[PDB]
From a paper:
In a double-blinded, placebo-controlled phase 1 human clinical trial, the recombinant, germline-targeting envelope glycoprotein (Env) trimer BG505 SOSIP.v4.1-[name].1, adjuvanted with AS01B, induced bnAb precursors of the [name]-class at a high frequency in the majority of vaccine recipients. The GT strategy for inducing [name]-class bnAb precursors is rooted in the hypothesis that these antibodies target the CD4bs with a similar angle of approach to [name] and use the same conserved contact residues. To verify that [name]-class mAbs elicited by [name].1 do not just exhibit similar sequence features to [name]-class bnAbs but also target the CD4bs in a similar manner and with the same atomic contacts, we selected five mAbs for further structural characterization.
Moreover, [name]-class bnAbs have very distinct and targetable genetic and structural characteristics. Specifically, they have restricted immunoglobulin heavy chain variable region alleles (IGHV1–2*02 or *04) and a short five amino acid light chain complementarity determining region 3 (CDRL3). A subset of isolated [name]-class monoclonal antibodies neutralized wild-type pseudoviruses and was structurally extremely similar to bnAb [name]. Hence, some [name].1-elicited [name]-class BCRs acquired mutations that confer strong binding to native trimers with intact glycan shields.
Residue numbers in the entry:
A (entry chain H), C (entry chain E): 1 to 52, 52A, 53 to 82, 82A, 82B, 82C, 83 to 100, 100A, ...
B (entry chain F): 4 to 9, 11 to 27, 30 to 91, 96 to 210
D (entry chain L): 3 to 9, 11 to 27, 30 to 91, 96 to 210
């Protein structure tokens, strides 16, 4: 029988590092590649990479290069996967899976681990939304609610609609606020969005221009 | 006070709102549209303020007061609270069912130049002024449906009794410039509306 | 025309104080009482109290006594409602409405003010749940997710069910974990529940007894 | 981008098929994933079966679209099913099996603890578990009169035994806990109601 046992579930702060172990039994650990796959919160399976145990060569996905390092210890037939600078998105289920030969037929998945990355106080990232025309400001990746957006320091109140926030899979909030202005004043009057996030003590002014 | 959690009807159904456990005399009703302060509908049992419609009428059955609306107009949907002395009711979610369907309005924004200067690329697809509150959002990259990194909020009430929702797509700057256009498709009551943006 | 203009929307930290203005125009400010009514975050209206502007006397609800200070400035015909040491439950819409006498025809309700009290990183208040029987622990008022619960330093793992947390009106989280043990061992072996909330760095142990 | 249906429903013997749109020729793999345990491979390449897997699972390819046919939906074969062509998997399909044995709920109610009462707080915890399906109504009564304020109920969720559990919390001041005679938690499930009553002893 072939068994793969993974480390215990861990909860980590953002910016910390988590190393998940994966001990192999019932087969020669060197003769098969070891892939690592996520599950994401409510999303689908995601391929992280693979590591040749016999030589140590590692291949990583283009979205994880520079953040993930896969090592192994042949003395105890175990593999490792480490994530550095954990983000709010990184909370997921991490599985180690054995590759039968080349290509990509998968054989076993072990048990999986839960690496929960809790949310911290974060300031929003405010970006413009270039353009009767509509222009606005994007308020992305802030925690927790609420945020306050005022245009031209409260002077512009007509045609302003600030849509309710969305709870992303990471757990952070994102919000948008757009205003409706005549098309003849685009290159004429500046439109500034004043965003306030008191929980993070963040006051930001951004200029919306075409 | 005990009130129904929600009542349902249609234009002309004329649903009556019950108010259990109230004492004799001095019963008032309030209509609260979200986003604005509530207004008085019944002075005491059956009286009406000047300037309010006669379509709203109150009555008492000794131990339980009630409010009758002769015709459920498309304008008259709100939370209703009956108050005896200094305590209100539970609140009735008075919803309609025969209202005309309103097609959604979709606005799509490509990732900003500033955001792209930080290795981030997000598409903002804002939906507004649609009734009822049930829209399906699907993203397509040059016709290929894409589901990874899509966050769509649940629809919410506006100040004009219509619904609004927002859909976001998180992308890396590389995959934003590779495709020729990204499309936000929103389907509402079978009729779909579509907006496309390009790296320009 | 009779108008009641209220102050702007305010966001406050827990423990802070908020004062809401209500300036009356178009009628004699002295001849009518001024009530203050909440809306709660998605719940129904909630009466706080009323104030006599002519005499200065006030009457508060039993659940707000010692917390709300209602005062008026008759010079400019304005009424004030002050909430001291805002809790996470205090995020709600606040309205001022005028009245008179024993009857309650609250004619005008002003406009309203949105007071939002953001959720703070708080550790759980662990309480015991005294009792084939079942005993457990209550994990109340913690934010944000997650919390880890173990019994007897992980020695007890049979018949343990840690229910998913509930999102209350305040925005905090409450969780419960229980263990099923034979009824003959209540007076023989103790029981300790260990609750971990890493975001607030809280580690607490409690003993559950009948 | 391999596209799978969001969810599929059936019953014993329904024999539903899961579609895997957008797959290339050859090298199509299917994985069955019961949450809380590692996913297990079911189909190697289009139609091959690992030793020890059930013949109930068979795969096929209709030119460009892969598919996973199950001969008869057993009440156990409920899970998320993913199709992978090389390293990228599908959206995932929520397989739900119907006609499953309905289970009566089990309810435990705890009065406010002594420590919590010494904090001017009072919480009643009504914990429900081991009921199928996950459709229950929780009502709080105080001396026969229902109470609605200060009630927070979580949505029922899957357990480790494929049954549903939900928890309900009633928040009160200490004065109203002692003044009343008994607070009761009533949960209705498929036409039968289960009641648990506590009091200030």
């Amino acid at each position: 029988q072939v068994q793969l046992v993974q480390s215990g579930a861990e909860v980590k702060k953002p910016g910390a590092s988590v190393k998940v172990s994966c001990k192999a039994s019932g087969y020669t650990f060197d003769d098969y590649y070891m892939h690592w796959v996520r599950q994401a919160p409510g999303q689908g399976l995601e391929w992280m990479g693979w590591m040749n145990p016999k030589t140590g060569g590692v291949n990583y996905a283009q979205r994880f290069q520079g953040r993930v390092t896969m090592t192994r210890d042949r003395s105890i037939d175990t593999a490792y996967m480490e994530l550095n600078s954990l983000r709010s998105d990184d909370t997921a289920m991490y599985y180690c899976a054995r590759d039968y030969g080349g290509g990509y037929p998968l054989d076993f998945w072990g048990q999986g681990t839960l690496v929960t990355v809790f949310n911290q106080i974060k300031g929003p990232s405010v970006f413009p939304l270039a353009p009767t025309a509509a222009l606005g400001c994007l308020v992305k990746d802030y925690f927790p609610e609420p945020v306050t957006v005022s245009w031209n320091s409260g002077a512009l109140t007509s045609g302003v609609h600030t849509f309710p926030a969305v709870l992303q899979s990471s757990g952070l909030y994102s919000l948008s606020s757009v205003v409706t202005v005549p098309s003849s004043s685009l290159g004429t009057q500046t439109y500034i969005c004043n965003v306030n996030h008191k929980p993070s003590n963040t006051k930001v002014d951004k200029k919306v221009e075409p | 006070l005990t009130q129904p959690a929600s009542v349902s009807g249609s234009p002309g159904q004329s649903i009556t709102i019950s108010c259990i456990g109230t004492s004799s005399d001095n019963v008032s009703w309030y209509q609260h549209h979200p986003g604005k302060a509530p207004k008085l509908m019944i002075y005491e049992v059956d009286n009406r303020p000047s300037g309010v419609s006669a379509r709203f009428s109150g009555s008492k059955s000794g131990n339980t007061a009630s409010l009758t609306i002769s015709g459920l107009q498309a304008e008259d949907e709100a939370d209703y609270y009956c108050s005896s002395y200094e305590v209100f009711g539970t609140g009735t979610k008075v919803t309609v069912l025969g209202q005309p369907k309103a097609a959604p309005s979709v606005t799509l924004f490509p990732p900003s130049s500033e955001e792209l200067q930080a290795n981030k690329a997000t598409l903002v697809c804002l939906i507004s002024d649609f009734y009822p509150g049930a829209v399906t959002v699907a993203w397509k990259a040059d016709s290929s449906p894409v589901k990874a990194g899509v966050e769509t909020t649940t629809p919410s009430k506006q100040s004009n009794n219509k619904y609004a929702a927002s859909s976001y797509l998180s992308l890396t700057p590389e995959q934003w410039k590779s495709h020729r256009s990204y499309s936000c498709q929103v389907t509402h009551e079978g009729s779909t509306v579509e907006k496309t943006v390009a790296p320009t």
